[PDB]
Amino acid sequence: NFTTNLNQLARVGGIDPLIGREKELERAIQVLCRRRKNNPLLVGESGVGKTAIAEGLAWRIVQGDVPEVMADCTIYSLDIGSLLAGTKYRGDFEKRFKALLKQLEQDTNSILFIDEIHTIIGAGAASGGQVDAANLIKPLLSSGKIRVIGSTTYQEFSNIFEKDRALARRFQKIDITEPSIEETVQIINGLKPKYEAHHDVRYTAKAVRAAVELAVKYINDRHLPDKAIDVIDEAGARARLMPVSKRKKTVNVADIESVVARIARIPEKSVSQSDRDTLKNLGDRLKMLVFGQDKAIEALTEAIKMARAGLGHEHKPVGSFLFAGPTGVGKTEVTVQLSKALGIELLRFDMSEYMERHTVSRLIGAPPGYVGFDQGGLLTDAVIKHPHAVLLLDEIEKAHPDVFNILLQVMDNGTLTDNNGRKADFRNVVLVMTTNTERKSIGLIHQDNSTMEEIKKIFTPEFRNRLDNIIWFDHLSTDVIHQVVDKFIVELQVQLDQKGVSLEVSQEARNWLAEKGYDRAMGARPMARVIQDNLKKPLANELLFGSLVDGGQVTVALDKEKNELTYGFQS
Amino acid sequence: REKELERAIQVLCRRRKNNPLLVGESGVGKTAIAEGLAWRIVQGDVPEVMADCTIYSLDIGSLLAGTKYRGDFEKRFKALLKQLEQDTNSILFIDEIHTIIGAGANLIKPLLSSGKIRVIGSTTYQEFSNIFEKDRALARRFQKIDITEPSIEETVQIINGLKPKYEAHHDVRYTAKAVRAAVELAVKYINDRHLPDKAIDVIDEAGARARLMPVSKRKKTVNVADIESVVARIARIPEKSVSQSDRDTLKNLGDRLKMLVFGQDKAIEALTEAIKMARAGLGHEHKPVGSFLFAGPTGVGKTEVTVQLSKALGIELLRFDMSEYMERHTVSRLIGAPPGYVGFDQGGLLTDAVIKHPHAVLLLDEIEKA
């Protein structure tokens, strides 16, 4: 059972020098210089440089910048796959594990570095609940002169470690602090010449800072030390492959945007100088998909640009808004189009189902020891999955008062805590609250049910005061309604163009559809259903029976007396 | 099997993946498909492209008899493959191919990749899913064929072909009506088994039953009564022509149950009528004899009638106290423990009890508490 050597590798190559870990290195050295219980335990997280500390110690000894008492030591990295190989044998693990220790006794100054200690030290050969998993090393660690550098995550530390008190006392925890962007900027600088020599490229200072800053802003799943190098590594490969006779050896910020976007699974949102083009004409391109409530577009687009300019607050979301207008105006349409414009996902929730007292926990999750804990909360889960999406909450006024408190904490601090101990980042989510009857007037003679002080009455000042700006939506004007129905006719036209037909429909047909489709209270919600049956169903049957399969010509005819939409078919 | 055999020949002629895999359920005549292929070669009905092609049936047991000190396994396979390959027309046939693939390694993977030699493999749907899907390399070369069951009329011909062997061994004669009855009766009642296997089991059993009754040679001719007896015995459907000895129990089931339990005559009538209905045959063939929910005041004979019913009918009472199974996890006891868990050795209490006593009354006391 051979074990990889970390000093032989560093003397030939393949071991990258560790930078900026003076404090952690000194602690590991100090721990390894102890007489008893000299077994460091590099407790960290995923993506942080845990193995780097261990491999850094190897290049330090080779170079010689180590205390003479701690010199001449050879760090050995055992192959877990080798020891764990072989099964259904009474002594395979014992022979392999005790062979490594025996071959290590010959070198009384050698150090052992076991990566992923929890895998082999949690259950080595725990067949049928055997208790031999970690009992072999325990006497060796406390008494034996053999040292065992362990590296595990913080979560695994709690799940397995600290429960076996005997094993925990024989290990010295070494806490990692997840270095900040500034610390990571110096780390990538030292590694810049190494990557530049392999890819024969050059990285600009702007690109280095942009890559680390963009990864933390968008790549939340991975940690900063490893993910940042991933972007730099990928940009070098892409900077070399994409050029065709251009010979663009330099690596500008542009290449960084491409790789981060692709690895983040987003539609080009994480790009520099590209958003400014859309921000310049965000309202213009939005006005082509929405008709009316133009004043609302100005309030929404300015706040978005205000937040994107980097002048907002760090402990608050990009912007909290309370869209207020009668039902059907199109606040949801503005949001469903804003997300596609800004290249962000869309989160849609309805507070109608969260009006009970026990249903509020469905957003943040049930407390531990109660029903609903395992899956968690849909709100915090969706936010963690898409921290850049747009949050839409329909009919917020119906929500229970406890739910308002949850939103208050979000708008005040910009973060929520999941029932599993996670932290839902809200600093990059556009919070959108929509606020607004079907039953006829209860009177002898029916009457109109159409409906600044209204919001103050239905919303406490503490909630209103936390909003960035309350955008108002104007009632759909009669002239505007003619524009809205045109979008459905042209939408069907492009859909029908794929089949090969052209609808002759003119404003005469839209006249009846307008009043029938649009309602003052329901708004334009029945409008979609109108085309679904009146315009789509009749053409569908004839189009498929064979008359218009190989190219078709259709038309519309509305008779005053019939008060219905007739159709004409040709081919 | 003219349509099933056609599938094998066309894939064999294919340039790639020329390895017909006759995947079928147990007792579906999978070996017959490949055994029948050899017959057509001599007759010459097979297409000329594949005409004059030898078929070799590999014996796993013969090759497994390794005499050399661990060198027989590889030497036997290596020399055998070359003999089949040099001819270039032979199409090897391996029944129960799953055994060869399993360690006992095979060393036939290079041969399959090249495709110079065609090998036919038979395997059950179970084993095919467990191992062949995992190894894409092995299953890619083999084209899974589907064999579900033969036609009803065709089965009677297969029985006639095999009838002389059974008649000579049992010294009995099977009437044409009996064979048609067995095929029709067996498929209708024994749903779990397949038409080819069960059809020959009842025929074999029917002959043994007739010969065994008389000490001397007698009862040569076999009547449909025996076929009904053996098919009913395996299917467990209540046999017709009920004996007068058993026509008293059902006739006096209510009176006996009324003496032990007084009052609540409606409960006794429902139970006795359902039991009598099942024996008549006018009962569901995919549902229990009777599902009855007994509710009422305390001490009204809800449990007593069930217990006495078992005693009167002489069948075991599988009494289960549902109060124990308050939690969802307790369901494992009834349905069964998982295959790999610590309790896998213990079987399902409900499943094992029902298997041990198929006709036993099942009493689920306090079902609501479950």
Binding site: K88, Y89, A125, S127, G128, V371, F373 | E327, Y341, V342
Partner: peptide
């Protein structure tokens, strides 16, 4: 109010094996 759920914990059976060898000659 609320219902306090209970999480059952499963146990898995893993057993070691020993090999009785046969001398070749």
């Amino acid at each position: 109010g609320k219902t306090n759920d209970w999480l059952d914990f499963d146990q898995l059976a893993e057993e070691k094996v020993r090999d009785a060898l046969k001398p070749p000659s």
